[PDB]
Design a protein around this nucleic acid. Sequence first.
RNA 1: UUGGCACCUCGAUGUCGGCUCAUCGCAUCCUGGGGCUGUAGUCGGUCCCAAGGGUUGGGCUGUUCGCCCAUUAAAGCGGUACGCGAGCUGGGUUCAGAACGUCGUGAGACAGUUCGGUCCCUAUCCGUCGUGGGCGUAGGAAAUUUGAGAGGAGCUGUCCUUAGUACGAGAGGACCGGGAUGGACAUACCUCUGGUGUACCAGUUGUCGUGCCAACGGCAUAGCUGGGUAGCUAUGUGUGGACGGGAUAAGUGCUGAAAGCAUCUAAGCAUGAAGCCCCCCUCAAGAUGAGAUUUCCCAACUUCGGUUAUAAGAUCCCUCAAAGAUGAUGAGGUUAAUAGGUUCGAGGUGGAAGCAUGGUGACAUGUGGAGCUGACGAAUACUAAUCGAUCGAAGACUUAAU
Lengths: 122, 53, 120, 216, 114
Amino acid sequence: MIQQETRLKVADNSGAREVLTIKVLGGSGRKTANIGDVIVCTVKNATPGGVVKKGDVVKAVIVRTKSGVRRNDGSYIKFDENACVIIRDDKGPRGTRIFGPVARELREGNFMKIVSLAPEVL
Amino acid sequence: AVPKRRTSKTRKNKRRTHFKISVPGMTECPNCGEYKLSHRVCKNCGSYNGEEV
Amino acid sequence: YRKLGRTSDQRKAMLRDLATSLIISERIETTEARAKEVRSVVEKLITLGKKGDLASRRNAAKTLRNVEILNEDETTQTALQKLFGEIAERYTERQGGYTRILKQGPRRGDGAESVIIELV
Amino acid sequence: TKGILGRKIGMTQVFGENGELIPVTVVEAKENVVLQKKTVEVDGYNAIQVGFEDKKAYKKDAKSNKYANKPAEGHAKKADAAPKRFIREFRNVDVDAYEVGQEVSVDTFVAGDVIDVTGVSKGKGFQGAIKRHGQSRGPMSHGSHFHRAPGSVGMASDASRVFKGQKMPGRMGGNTVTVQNLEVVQVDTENKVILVKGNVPGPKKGLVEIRTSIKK
Amino acid sequence: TNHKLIEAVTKSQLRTDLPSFRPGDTLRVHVRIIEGTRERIQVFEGVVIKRRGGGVSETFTVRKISSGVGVERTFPLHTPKIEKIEVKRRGKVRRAKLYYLRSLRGKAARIQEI
RNA sequence: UUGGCACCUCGAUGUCGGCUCAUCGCAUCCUGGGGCUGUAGUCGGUCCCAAGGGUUGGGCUGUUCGCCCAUUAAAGCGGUACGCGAGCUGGGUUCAGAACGUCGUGAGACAGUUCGGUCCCUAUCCGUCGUGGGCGUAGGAAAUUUGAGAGGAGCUGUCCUUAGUACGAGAGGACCGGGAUGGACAUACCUCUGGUGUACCAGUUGUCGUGCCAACGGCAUAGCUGGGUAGCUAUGUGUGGACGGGAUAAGUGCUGAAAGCAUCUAAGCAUGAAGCCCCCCUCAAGAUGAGAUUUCCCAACUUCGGUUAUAAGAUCCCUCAAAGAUGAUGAGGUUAAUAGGUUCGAGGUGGAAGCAUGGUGACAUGUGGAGCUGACGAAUACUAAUCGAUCGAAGACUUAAU
Ligand SMILES: [Mg+2]
Ligand SMILES: [Mg+2]
Ligand SMILES: [Mg+2]
Ligand SMILES: [Mg+2]
Ligand SMILES: [Mg+2]
Ligand SMILES: [Mg+2]
Ligand SMILES: [Mg+2]
Ligand SMILES: [Mg+2]
Ligand SMILES: [Mg+2]
Ligand SMILES: [Mg+2]
Ligand SMILES: [Mg+2]
Ligand SMILES: [Mg+2]
Ligand SMILES: [Mg+2]
Ligand SMILES: [Mg+2]
Ligand SMILES: [Mg+2]
Ligand SMILES: [Zn+2]
């Protein structure tokens, strides 16, 4: 459950370390986003030397949430953290490596390259 | 807030239409014949349901 | 369960007091709602007494008050001893229903429905 | 188009054919009997009157609704049936397909049927505008003395009145509610139960009416 | 019991091939991934931290550390999506719900074996 | 809007902005339907119909405005005492303090600034939201109902396909049609995920008790902590705005004269919007126009107008909950499972006490998924719903037909 001002870890080597959510995309008055949704965010913390810089306004796909997700079979998955991956306009990642597990819902989201790079897909 | 106009006798008594009490729910005690409250011990003889209390 | 116009601790205390007093006197006058709550407490205490084992006795001790009963023979016994002695022996063959409540009518001071609750 | 009366038993779940979790409501719909048959000729409209859940026979000093009174007993004995707890009309059915006295078994519905379910929603007693009408609270701090109030009820000199339909505190629930386009998940004729997909209005033991969904 | 009718209509959903286990036991849950038409088994190995509910509604939760990130999977105990469950290890715990593990990492989070 | 006037109010008509709650207009921001286009397509421009619904979060500033960030189909303009302070706030502004600049000899002053600075009221009437009683509805009753009216709802994105087709040098790229899946909103509901869960279980500190040990109780926010049943719940789970019909608006026409032609119009016949009337959901016969169907009760006495207690039925009183402020509603009242108890379970907790064993000991292990357990399921008259009482028909007249 990601809303404006929620902070998230970046699960990639794009250069951004922590982002703040500026907007949940996908409709007027949409309050919260979950795994597989795209957000506008600003880079609050970055590694020196990265491609993405502090203060950049970027778009990210949420890949892990503490709230988790429910699946049609009545099972659930929940994570210890809220993580997202900075993306380009074509849903491809800005970085080259993904860190930590990702939910399978990204596949239905068509974030195929993120899914492929992820160390584990759950 | 305060009453803008005093209340006429008519209006007051209309309002008091339903302000009243009822006769108690009472029946004759089968033991001693004195009235009692239904489902209560009879205070006259101390009987209830054919036995002394 | 009723709240009986008291906080949780006060209600617990009052129900223990009433249960003990009903064990002692075998019949007590009280308000209707109090009697309808204390009947359950007292009858569960009767159940413990009828079970009779040490664990039952200690469970009962958690609830009963520490009161001394002076018997007719100048002998004394606690409420817990009375419960696990004469009351339990009395109700050995009765399955529940150890109390009855007899409505008496409203009292003068406040109109409360006075009732008698007694064992048996 | 079909119809039946049951009691809400409760909710549970079943696993579908692909393992999907389907929440279901269990409706016990035993002892449905066609008590009366209404026609345009006599009543001005077509409908079947259905009685549900036998109650006990008339007795002299009955004190509750458990025992049928004489009017109800006569009405039911005309249909040859035992007196019933609930009686409701279905106008959505074809009267010519029913006989007075006929049983209405749960088997009239089949798995996959799309249905409207009608009940009386749970009562909530006297409720305020936030709960009853979903209004916004005032601030809880910053000097506010407005938390759960209903807000302005009109304007000023124009209109010097509160309009009908103003939302205010009052009794909540206990209303007839129809939930449309539910689905019959399962019919168990041995237990006389229907498993309906989703949730339906009313408390447990509450009367529910199941009809073929009006929209199609 | 629960309501007789509920139990009667849900009885045939219950599976009988499930090993006994308790919170604190380490499980390997073989889960059927049916992506498209291909079907495969993915194993989730972790500690049982929670079991709740009854009948067909009963659920359980297994916790794992993946790439340094805790992950919890909750399953309906009788879901047909589980091929099987293997009890890999019996843990020694003192309570039904091991929520305190969510806040522990590393050697602090280890469960003693029976 | 800035003003002009000074007609109501100075024995007081609270004043900016915001919050809560809206309501109306249309001069329409989006969506729907059209004409023209310097409309190839995709986009646009302009005008016409159209008010059903919809019409966002933030930064700055008291601000309204306005600018900016990021969205959206869109981020409409106005009225309602610049709607709404006996509904809230009180940041601005025009009380008393103090200070700067300025003016003034001064006291002081300034639509200059700055820091600080008391927002009362138990609702009588109408009004509005709920909820009862009376009488009426030409006998007295129990159910099921028609629907005159009224209220609700009414929004929309994206993607796939048609089709890389029509159109276009190219770039790009459709109408119409067919599918899928979302946002916001509404409603029901607790199986699931969670919250709460003050008479559920467990751990633990201090201290005071139950003579001591052991085991327990009180108080310390429920002492604190870890869990948690029912109920109530959203952020959770379902469902909805679907499909259509009739009449229309702007329009588009057909046939067609006045006016030998022409012409959508005069007569006549079609077609045509998210709009109108329905369709869908809810209330509804005090609809005094008081409707309908099924069933139940039906005698004596009479000044023979009428009366009567009774009937069917419903209550008082009592046990209650799915209902509830109280009434009311609903489950029951011995020919009884209504509640309590009791017994057995579910779910919850997580291994009681006692004893035994192993340790110097703190503890550990066994007996033993143990002990306990509110609300949830079942069974059982053990307790209490006793004994009683009250209300409640005899069916007006006229005409027509039979
Ligand atoms: Mg205390
Ligand atoms: Mg708010
Ligand atoms: Mg306050
Ligand atoms: Mg005056
Ligand atoms: Mg217009
Ligand atoms: Mg004014
Ligand atoms: Mg104003
Ligand atoms: Mg005012
Ligand atoms: Mg101020
Ligand atoms: Mg000077
Ligand atoms: Mg729930
Ligand atoms: Mg439950
Ligand atoms: Mg003390
Ligand atoms: Mg000690
Ligand atoms: Mg003290
Ligand atoms: Zn007497």
